[PDB]
């Protein structure tokens with residue numbers, strides 16, 4: 661089924677992080693509690709209209725990918741959509757909206773940048789009790805600019821529609837950055853817990 665494929669993607673993309681679980685917590689797998697498909701017709705039209713535009717500018721190819729997004733503002737994103745106006749220029753690839761192909765990378769951003777102070781009730785970044793929320797998004801990358809080192813962009817590079825952060829000696833894992841909110845749709849809302857290693 662549809663939700664089994666989302667759970668498998670969530671579980672199989674977990675990696676061992678270099679910070680030893682400082683930001684996201686210590687875990688090898690999750691306890692998937694709920695997977696909800698977000699049905700926001702106004703946001704979907706905004707996304708498909710921009711997707712068609714990008715396809716025409718990238719040899720009839722949208723370069724669409726299913727990627728994870730961690731944020732304490734998931735409730736605002738599912739109702740209002742992604743918003744580049746809230747993006748900070750101080751990020752590695754500048755004022756963009758960041759996505760990961762590894763669920764455990766996006767899990768480090770659920771309670772804030774670098775996990776913030778953790779869950780709101782126990783102030784624990786490795787909290788195994790509090791229910792976390794992650795987004796599994798449809799992202800239009802189009803002509804993606806391949807980059808290894810820090811490149812503080814305000815917008816996509818000329819002639820491009822996104823930035824792909826590739827790992828080097830550098831990033832540990834890949835990341836995908838868009839500079840227009842309408843180039844991503846929050847398709848699935850995942851309610852989960854990080855699980856204590858066995």
Ligand SMILES: NC(=O)c1cccc(N)c1
Nearest residue numbers: 729730758759760766769
């Ligand atoms: N907010 C996120 O899920 C995310 C994804 C990739 C890279 C970064 N920095 C954040």
Ligand SMILES: [Zn+2]
Nearest residue numbers: 779782787790
């Ligand atoms: Zn907690």
